[model samples]
Target: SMSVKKPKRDDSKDLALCSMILTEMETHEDAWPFLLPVNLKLVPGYKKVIKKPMDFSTIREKLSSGQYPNLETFALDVRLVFDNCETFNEDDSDIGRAGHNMRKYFEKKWTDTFK
Candidate 1:
């Protein structure tokens, strides 16, 4: 499989769209809870349970550094933020509802143009 061809061959072409998506996601009214990494001090034992964490700022910086290779990878990271929120903050919590709201907002934007 060394010479296998890849689908969505080059994400660089969609970099602008990726940028646009993150920008909107970051600026969203419900994005405040996800703007930065969760503070370990504020949420003790968080690291123990949530093995993987994601946030808007880290995604933005990764975009700047050109770390993604596929469109789904970018989308995956964005999705991670919302899913992680669900795990830590249950659906009944304020932050959890924000995640639900933002995910709906994001998927709407994402699916509209991409699919």
Candidate 2:
């Protein structure tokens, strides 16, 4: 599902996060198709499991049993879920490491994005 609550009224953090991610993503062009909202997959298993415009019943079914049936797909979903919350809660001091992992996750996923 799309973000339910818009983040607090601060574009700086999201901007920074987006910038960092976008830069890291430059190296691995392959994963761009996977991470971007526009090229998102429509297949069943993990992609369809999390694809938004999700029906309420599907959400309930998936949440009730967390089987994605695909390891990499599951990781992608988990990374995104963590990325959103991780930066939001990070203080300035934590942003450095958080940004590092965020970049790493993107690069790694990109390497695997097309696999």
Candidate 3:
């Protein structure tokens, strides 16, 4: 008989971290303007769907429901939002700066989860 074994992992820490990030995002006043939906017609052919505001609550609610099995999966899923976003010029945009700040916060918080 063959059997599959799963590696042991602690999820409480990761879940807490995820919740913390969500709380910060929800309360961060400065970041709200950048996260608002934008009219993509100005860019010509830029899909309006892609320009919709991010629904951070959806991700948070999913995580809170314990849908993810591990931290790695949670991290990857959460990261896709940041990685695939289509807005803001890094060189001259407050939205870009806000995104960068959020990324930095995630990096620091995730790193601290293990420490």
Candidate 4:
């Protein structure tokens, strides 16, 4: 007979870490634009451009549910917030700059916390 085990994903340590980072993102000055989901009406060509768009509130709900599989998964969603932003807006535009700033902030914080 043989038995196999699967790795469990609910790492509480990472869960708390994600929670902290998400709260920081929520309070971040450049967080305004990415706080909520981009609506089709508000941003006319948005939905057509970015697939699987992510946002601070959505991340919050995921954290609130403890559904994130790992730090990398949480980070991916966090990164998507900026990735989606970068793909849509011009780098010189206000929203674009905010996305850039938020990305830098997140990476710095990620390094500080994990590295």
Candidate 5:
């Protein structure tokens, strides 16, 4: 099984921060694949199978379940999920553009927003 080290931040704060960030974005539809919550369980079998997009509500539930440590950790986990996914290619498609924009947004503003 695959494993991830939990960070030292709180889950509710993570959700709130991520939600706040998502609200100011115009790229959510395509960006959801990279920003939305995923079942980390899939990581172990990830390399062995193909998959489809996840349901939005399910992702929301998992995210709201207080499983994440913080926004940074959640974002990192989401990126890891993308890495494990068999179909997420970071090319010139809408999804790729959206993902890049989303990450860039966080990279530029996370420190200022939190500090």
Candidate 6:
């Protein structure tokens, strides 16, 4: 039997994606790998930012088969945003917080704006 499958892309993959985006946005110094180790005293990998404990291979299988799951699935099936716009609400759901607040142009925010 032949079955067609849709592309398996979800915004949840933003952690990896956005990290790349942010690296491109910095000043040359900011992006300098040599300075990063000294200045921030931090490394992105050391933060434990990316989700762990979930075996992503099964999730890859489901997404390739057109069944997008969610956070629960990452713990179980490891499939996220598999089904589609209905139950999973994959298209509109804010499932991942990666790339949530990064900005391109600098915008000044006055304290009075909170009032």
lDDT per residue, candidate 6, 25-73, as tens digits? 3332322221122212343332243332222233344445655444333
lDDT of 2 at 79: 58
- The true-versus-predicted C-alpha distance at residue 43 of model 2, in Å, is 37
Clash list (residue pairs), candidate 2: none
lDDT of 2 by residue, 16-62 (tens): 34334444543444332234332235433434444443222332244
**What TM-score would every model get versus the actual structure?**
0.88, 0.27, 0.62, 0.87, 0.48, 0.18
| lDDT by candidate, in order shown | 0.88, 0.42, 0.60, 0.88, 0.53, 0.29
Tell me the tens digit of each residue's lDDT in model 1 across 8-106.
Answer: 444455889988988998888989999999997889878888888989999999988979876889899999998888888889888989999999999
Residue-by-residue lDDT tens digits, candidate 5, 11-93: 44556766565455424555566544455576554334535444334344556786655566555644444443335554587
- How well is each residue in 61-115 modelled by candidate 3, as lDDT tens digits? 6777977787777677546545534343453467666666666776777777665
Span of ten consecutive residues with least summed lDDT in model 6: 101-110
Q: Indicate the residue-level lDDT of 7 in model 2.
A: 59
What's the true lDDT of residue 110 in model 2? 48
TM-score of 4: 0.87
Task: Identify the superior model by TM-score, candidate 3 or candidate 4.
Answer: 4
The global Cα lDDT (0 to 1) of model 3 is 0.60
Poorest lDDT segment (10 consecutive residues) of candidate 4: 1-10
lDDT by residue for model 4 (9-106), tens: 55557778878988898899989999999987887888888889889999999878977877888898999999999999999999999999999999
